[PDB]
Design a protein around this ligand. Structure first.
Ligand code: CLA
Ligand code: CLA
Ligand code: CLA
Ligand code: CLA
Ligand code: CLA
Ligand SMILES: CCCCCCCCCCCCCCCC(=O)OC[C@H](CO[C@@H]1O[C@H](CS(=O)(=O)O)[C@@H](O)[C@H](O)[C@H]1O)OC(=O)CCCCCCCCCCCCCCC
Ligand SMILES: CCCCCCCCCCCCCCCCCCCC(=O)O[C@H](COC(=O)CCCCCCCCCCCCCC)COP(=O)(O)OCCN
Ligand SMILES: CC(/C=C/C=C(C)/C=C/[C@@]12O[C@]1(C)C[C@@H](O)CC2(C)C)=C\C=C\C=C(C)\C=C\C=C(C)\C=C\[C@@]12O[C@]1(C)C[C@@H](O)CC2(C)C
Ligand SMILES: CC(/C=C/C=C(C)/C=C/[C@@]12O[C@]1(C)C[C@@H](O)CC2(C)C)=C\C=C\C=C(C)\C=C\C=C(C)\C=C\[C@@]12O[C@]1(C)C[C@@H](O)CC2(C)C
Ligand SMILES: CC1=C(/C=C/C(C)=C/C=C/C(C)=C/C=C/C=C(C)/C=C/C=C(C)/C=C/C2=C(C)CCCC2(C)C)C(C)(C)CCC1
Ligand SMILES: CC1=C(/C=C/C(C)=C/C=C/C(C)=C\C=C\C=C(C)/C=C/C=C(C)/C=C/C2=C(C)CCCC2(C)C)C(C)(C)CCC1
Ligand SMILES: CCCCCCCCCCCCO[C@H]1O[C@H](CO)[C@@H](O[C@H]2O[C@H](CO)[C@@H](O)[C@H](O)[C@H]2O)[C@H](O)[C@H]1O
Ligand code: SF4
Lengths: 105, 74, 68, 197, 165, 41, 226, 80
């Protein structure tokens, strides 16, 4: 069965820890050749309303009060991944306790 | 506009096979697709035609609607 | 003028003109004009084109020696 | 500096000259690019270490009479209790997959963030407690020995997989069958590896 | 018994088709006197039908639900079930003959392009040269792969006419 | 004679000869081997 | 020069006219040996197929002749594998097939490597210190432990005579083995039995008396006898 | 009306003008060819696009080119 709070919380805490302490050094170096200044970088000048709507807002990159570069956008993404993994584990356990064996015998 | 995601042009630039298997690879294709409406039109029509063929080949073998297999003319 | 403007008369040449019918084909030099026209090299080909002709005029930069 | 030749008289590869474990090889000219060659080198090294680990596990699970490696995780299927030499450690599959995933996630994330080609090949330092890699000659000899035993471990793991796919016999029973009845029990007598024998 | 197909010898509908053909042949035969040429022709046709129906049997042929023989296609499946000669060997023989024809034509083209006015040799054939190349093509695959090895089989793209882009 | 021989050396005449030879070979094979379908001896 | 002409009055091919080759008779009407490297590969292939032919033909004939005389009790070649498979201490067919096929793979890989690069098997420190004698002398003639009695260490004329004898008996063995297979498929008996039948009744026992070898001949014989 | 364009590959053979059934082409003096002639199209509004000039061109590809579009009374060859 597995209780939902412990599984969900452990999955999202582990995923956030992997995002901050593990994958963050690998982050900002995969975006270096992705949205870097040397390459095309920005895609829109921002002249009219639609062009500046294409332009990034001043909310996702203003500052990083964390010691690392872990912004709240990365917090949301890694928390979504953790919720996904926790619900996957809960779903597998739910199928397991129902008397159904999905694995090859 | 957020700080995460994938850039299509960067993915097209990166997917160039080494040792000159595909030459320059998929580079320069982002502007080719974006500037040409007919490229996107051909891709869309090809994919929708493939999907329509899939619908035809899967509806008769797997009838999704009740009392549809008995209706032969339909 | 010293020597000649174009290749040796009667020598084989390869046409580098992409829009020509005889692109990447070998022909024989009939005459090269010394006046200074745009396409002085007259090349004759064994295989005729769709129009039935077998001779054409080419410039100096679109003719080279045939590879072997 | 060449460790040998896989076929005496093959055409030598100029790019496969100073690499450790150089037995020429590469008939398909794979990995001619230097960056792809370095990627293949580090991938071969980690596949070598993983095959070493797996071959050791498969051998030690059988020389101690503790069961086949194939039916070792079967307690997950049958809902039994896990065992390791008889300790009967109290862990569940929920508390095993998650900890394995996060531990190898942090391990491979730290390994992938090396940003040094030689350290990606051979990190050293904290991974070398006793440290016989100080002398370069012994370091090169142990590099060659590690590559050779890793390739043997890879072909051993493939052999274990193929042998258990073709026949239900375990590793030690298969070895005893090959020594007891060599000409009467081999891969050609299965009827599966060779169609029609 | 592969693909749910019974062998022709043990089949049922195969015998029904054989009896039907023999019955209509006998019905056509009964309309003529025994000492006549149409009687002999119909008897020869009946004998050929019986021989064909016998030879289609005892050869591994399979038929499914209609008595009409079916050909096993996949090699290996055909090799291990005595069906290689159905399509595996006929395509080998056809490939041999087709490569013979192609190699003979290639040799004629190459040898006829050397002389002045090759189109005259193309439209007025050199019969002794054609017959000499006809009897020299029995080892076409060896020669073809050796020209592939030395590169004379292929032409460089720099010397081949290329349509504009 | 050599003019006549070059006339027979023309493409339609040798094509007719090849067609006659191939048709006769296949017809005599099918007549002396009635109804061949299965490659067996 | 050339040892002889396979077809007198015929034009010798240019690649075989001035060729100093052992056992040459200008028999290339298809011009297969035009290239010198292709000629070398064909020479090696002829040598291996020849050694195949004489080994198989000797193993068919000498035990067959001994059993015809009655000294031995081995079966004929077309059922010896069948009875040997059904032996009481018989190794399975697949095991023997793959084992001696792998052994062939070893020797033939060595042969391919020393053909594509001559003398390349003499790379030091490769085969237990015995690799120094693996260097080939000529195309298809390795020497060393392949000739431990030193019969090839003689005058060059004697060596060419020995090569000519080897290739002549080899070609005779190729046609002999082809005849063995063909007349076993036709008659259904052993080669010694076929020789005895030809010796006892030459006219009645031949290839033309049976309709298997030449189809339609029996019908002509029946029409003539009618 | 149609568009008639003449390039520098023309040799001044006057074949396109002779093949023209509506007097569209002309020959002007030139220095880029041996014949010192170059084709011109001063009456391109009378051209119908019959491509008879392109048929008579002896040079490889075409030294004269006719591009259709914007048909008029004269370009459509109408007597009514
Ligand atoms: C690409 C086309 C193609 C396709 C679709 C098949 C399909 C098949 N082959 Mg075949 N095969 C092919 C080409 C193909 N073959 C060729 C070119 C060869 C080499 C001659 C073979 C040699 C081969 C063998 C030796 C065997 C098959 C067998 C099979 C069957 C099972 C294959 C499998 O993975 O299980 C299947 C009907 C197997 C079989 O008989 O199935 C029971 C089998 O033993 N195939
Ligand atoms: C009654 C028997 C019969 C008949 C009349 C035909 C008739 C034909 N066949 Mg078919 N075929 C048959 C049985 C038959 N086939 C069988 C039993 C098989 C085996 C299953 C094949 C396999 C086959 C292939 C693979 C091809 C044909 C082709 C052809 C056509 C042209 C042949 C050609 O160009 O001239 C003779 C050949 C030449 C002048 C040039 C030589 C080219 C050959 C095909 C190459 C052979 C060597 C090559 C390297 C081997 C690999 C082949 C490759 C496809 C893998 C022709 C309509 C060809 C075709 O339609 O192309 C459009 C073709 O490519 N046939
Ligand atoms: C013997 C000469 C010869 C050779 C070697 C080839 C070879 C080839 N042709 Mg070509 N072809 C030929 C004659 C030849 N063709 C003729 C005469 C025609 C006009 C009918 C064509 C029409 C043709 C087309 C339309 C196509 C090919 C294609 C091909 C390729 C596929 C292989 C194949 O069998 O195609 C199949 C070829 C045929 C079905 C043509 C057969 C024509 C006759 C029956 C054969 C002529 C034999 C010739 C008279 C022998 C002369 C011997 C001499 C001593 C007199 C291959 C490169 C295909 C391609 O591009 O693939 C990449 C393709 O689409 N060919
Ligand atoms: C392209 C498709 C195709 C295919 C695959 C076939 C294949 C076949 N059909 Mg069909 N047929 C076709 C098209 C096709 N046909 C068409 C278009 C028609 C309408 C015109 C027919 C009409 C037809 C009829 C009416 C009949 C057939 C029959 C046959 C069989 C003939 C086998 C044969 O003659 O023995 C094999 C023959 C050979 C292998 C020929 C030998 C050639 C080799 C190269 C040896 C050369 C001889 C010699 C030794 C060379 C050396 C000497 C030389 C130098 C002089 C075979 C199953 C007959 C049959 O039995 O059906 C089952 C039959 O009754 N078919
Ligand atoms: C397959 C075995 C084989 C091979 C590779 C050779 C190769 C050679 N022999 Mg040889 N020969 C052979 C069998 C073979 N022979 C047999 C069995 C006989 C007796 C009938 C002879 C009689 C013979 C004579 C009398 C002479 C040669 C000569 C030659 C050379 C000419 C090139 C040549 O034949 O093309 C290479 C041949 C092949 C690759 C064989 C292809 C086989 C095809 C694929 C099928 C044939 C089936 C067949 C009709 C039955 C070459 C070194 C001449 C020589 O040494 O000059 C330098 C010479 O004087 N040979
Ligand atoms: C057994 C399964 C196959 C194992 C690998 C052998 C076949 C591939 C090979 O040799 O080169 C890989 C080749 C060419 O390598 C070329 O070069 C590169 C190979 S490397 O850089 O030399 O390693 C490769 O990355 C690149 O995409 C390609 O263009 O790539 C292909 O697409 C070959 C055809 C498909 C092969 C199976 C997939
Ligand atoms: C390579 C191909 C190997 C085929 C091996 C076939 C072994 C069995 C065998 O010879 O028996 C049959 C006899 O056919 C015969 O008439 C002999 C064919 C000889 C095949 C090898 C050349 C051949 O198979 P079959 O005639 O029963 O097959 C169905 C028709 N396609
Ligand atoms: C075979 C293999 C690699 C083969 C590579 C080949 C052929 C390369 C081919 C080429 O070189 C050629 C020929 C020629 C060149 O031109 C081209 C290339 C492409 C270069 C790797 C195996 C690699 C194998 C590995 C890493 C095995 C790992 C095993 C593990 C982890 C086992 C663990 C467990 O078994 C225990 C211990 C106990 C059990 O109860 C549970 C489990 C979990 C099953
Ligand atoms: C190796 C060999 C045979 C080996 C057979 C073996 C091991 C069989 C095994 C067994 O039997 C034993 C031993 C004993 C039994 O108890 C068991 C079995 C299992 C039954 C034959 C080679 C046989 C090789 C042969 C027949 C080669 C023939 C080549 C020819 C005719 C070439 C001719 C031409 O190439 C030229 C010269 C010039 C060109 O221009 C024209 C052409 C025509 C192309
Ligand atoms: C001209 C052109 C164009 C167009 C094109 C087109 C129109 C195309 C199409 C195409 C197509 C139309 C394609 C298709 C494809 C498909 C595919 C590729 C598929 C695949 C599949 C798979 C892979 C599968 C698999 C599987 C599964 C999943 C299940 C079952 C089993 C198997 C394994 C089989 C464009 C516009 C671009 C522009 C340029 C030029
Ligand atoms: C305040 C702060 C802090 C803290 C923080 C924390 C502690 C956090 C946490 C967090 C967590 C702990 C979590 C998060 C999350 C997020 C997100 C964003 C999520 C999402 C989700 C999702 C998206 C889901 C989905 C779904 C659904 C809906 C259904 C179906 C299934 C799925 C799963 C798909 C600190 C002190 C450090 C610093 C300062 C500040
Ligand atoms: C163009 C080249 C053609 C072939 C070479 C020249 C012809 C040579 C003779 C060919 C026919 C020889 O005949 C051989 O095959 C016949 C094929 O039905 C078979 O014929 C035999 O069996 C048949 C039933 O199966 C009966 O109907 C026949 O009356 C009987 O003679 C025999 O196996 C054999 O008599
Ligand atoms: S037909 Fe062509 S080459 Fe001749 S004058 Fe006109 S444009 Fe020039």
């Amino acid at each position: 069965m597995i209780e939902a709070p412990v599984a969900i919380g452990g999955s999202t805490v582990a995923l956030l820890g992997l995002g901050r302490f593990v994958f963050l050094p690998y982050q900002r170096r995969r975006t270096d050749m992705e949205v870097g200044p040397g390459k095309l970088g920005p895609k829109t000048t921002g002249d009219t309303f639609f062009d500046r709507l294409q332009k990034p807002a001043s909310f996702v990159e203003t500052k990083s009060k964390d010691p690392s570069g872990f912004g709240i956008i990365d917090v949301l993404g890694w928390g979504a991944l953790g919720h996904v993994f926790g619900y996957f584990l809960l779903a597998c356990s739910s199928l397991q306790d129902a008397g159904i064996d999905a694995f090859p015998r | 506009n957020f700080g995460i995601g994938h850039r299509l042009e960067a993915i097209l630039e990166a997917h160039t096979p080494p040792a000159g298997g595909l030459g320059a690879g998929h580079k320069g294709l982002f502007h080719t697709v974006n500037n040409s409406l007919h490229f996107q039109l051909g891709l869309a029509l090809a994919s929708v035609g493939t999907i329509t063929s899939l619908v035809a080949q899967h509806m008769y073998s797997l009838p999704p609607y009740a009392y549809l297999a008995v209706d032969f003319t339909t | 003028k010293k020597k000649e403007v174009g290749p040796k008369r009667g020598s084989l040449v390869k046409v580098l003109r992409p829009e020509s019918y005889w692109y990447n084909q070998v022909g024989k030099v009939v005459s090269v004009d010394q006046s200074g026209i745009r396409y002085p090299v007259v090349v004759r080909f064994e295989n005729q084109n769709y129009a039935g002709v077998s001779t054409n005029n080419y410039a100096l930069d679109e003719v080279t020696d045939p590879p072997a | 500096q060449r460790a040998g030749n896989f076929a005496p008289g093959s055409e030598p590869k100029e790019y496969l000259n100073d690499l450790p474990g150089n037995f020429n090889f590469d008939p398909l000219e794979l990995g001619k690019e230097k960056g792809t060659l370095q990627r293949y080198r580090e991938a071969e090294l980690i596949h070598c270490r993983w095959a070493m680990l797996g071959a050791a596990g498969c051998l030690a699970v059988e020389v101690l009479g503790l069961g086949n490696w194939y039916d070792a995780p079967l307690w997950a299927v049958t809902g039994d209790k896990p065992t390791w030499f008889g300790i009967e450690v109290p862990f569940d599959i929920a508390t095993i997959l998650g900890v394995e995933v996060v531990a190898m996630a942090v391990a491979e994330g730290l390994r992938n963030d090396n940003q040094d080609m030689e350290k990606r090949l051979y990190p050293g330092g904290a991974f070398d407690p006793l440290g016989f890699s100080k002398d370069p000659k012994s370091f090169e000899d142990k590099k060659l020995k590690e590559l050779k035993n890793g390739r043997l471990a890879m072909v051993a793991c493939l052999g274990f997989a193929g042998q258990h796919a073709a026949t239900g016999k375990p590793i030690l029973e298969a070895l005893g069958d090959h020594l007891s009845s060599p000409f009467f029990n081999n891969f050609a007598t299965n009827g599966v590896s060779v169609p029609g024998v | 018994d592969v693909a749910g197909l019974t062998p022709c010898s043990e089949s049922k509908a195969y015998n029904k088709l054989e009896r039907k053909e023999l019955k209509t042949l006998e019905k056509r035969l009964k309309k003529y006197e025994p000492g006549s040429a149409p009687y002999l022709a119909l008897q020869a046709t009946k004998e050929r039908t019986q021989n064909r129906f016998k030879n289609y049997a005892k050869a591994g042929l399979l038929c499914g639900n209609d008595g009409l023989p079916h050909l096993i296609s996949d090699p290996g499946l055909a090799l291990r079930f005595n069906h290689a000669g159905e399509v595996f060997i006929p395509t080998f023989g056809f490939l041999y003959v087709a490569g013979y024809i192609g190699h003979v034509g290639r040799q004629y083209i190459i040898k006829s392009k050397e002389d002045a006015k090759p189109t005259d040799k193309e439209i007025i054939l050199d019969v002794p040269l054609a017959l000499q190349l006809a009897f020299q093509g029995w080892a076409w695959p060896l020669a073809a792969i050796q020209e592939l090895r030395n590169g004379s089989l292929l032409e460089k793209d720099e010397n081949i006419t290329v349509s504009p882009r | 004679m050599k003019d006549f021989t070059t006339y027979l050396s023309t493409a339609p005449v040798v094509g007719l000869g090849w067609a006659i030879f191939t048709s006769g070979l296949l017809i005599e094979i099918n007549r002396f081997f009635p109804d061949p379908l299965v490659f067996s001896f | 020069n050339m040892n002889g002409n396979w077809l007198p009055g015929s034009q010798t091919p240019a690649h075989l006219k001035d060729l100093k080759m052992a056992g040459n008779f200008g028999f290339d009407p298809l011009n297969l040996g035009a290239e010198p490297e292709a000629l070398r590969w064909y020479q090696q292939a002829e040598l291996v197929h020849s050694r195949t032919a004489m080994m198989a033909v000797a193993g068919i004939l000498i035990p067959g002749l001994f059993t015809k005389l009655g000294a031995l009790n081995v079966p004929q070649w077309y059922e010896a594998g069948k009875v040997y498979i059904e032996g009481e201490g018989a190794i399975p067919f697949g095991t023997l097939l793959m084992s001696t096929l792998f052994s062939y793979a070893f020797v033939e890989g060595k042969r391919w490597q020393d053909f594509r690069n001559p003398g390349s098997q003499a790379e030091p420190g490769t085969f237990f210190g015995l690799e120094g004698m693996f260097k080939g002398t000529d195309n298809g003639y390795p020497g060393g432990i392949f000739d431990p009695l030193g019969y090839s260490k003689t005058s060059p004329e004697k060596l060419d005579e020995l090569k000519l004898k080897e290739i002549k008996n080899g070609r005779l063995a190729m046609v002999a083995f082809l005849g063995f297979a063909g007349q076993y498929s036709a008659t259904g008996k052993g080669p010694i039995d076929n020789l005895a039948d030809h010796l006892a009744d030459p006219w009645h026992n031949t290839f033309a008396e049976n309709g298997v070898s030449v189809p339609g001949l029996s019908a002509v014989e029946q029409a003539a006898a009618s | 009306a149609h568009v008639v364009k003449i390039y520098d590959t023309c040799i001044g053979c006057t074949q396109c003008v002779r093949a023209c059934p509506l007097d569209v082409l002309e020959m002007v003096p030139w220095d880029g060819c041996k014949a010192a002639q170059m084709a011109s199209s001063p009456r391109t509004e009378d051209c119908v696009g019959c491509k008879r000039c392109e048929t008579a061109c002896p040079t490889d590809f075409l030294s004269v080119r006719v591009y259709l579009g914007n048909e008029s009374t004269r370009s459509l060859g109408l007597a009514y």
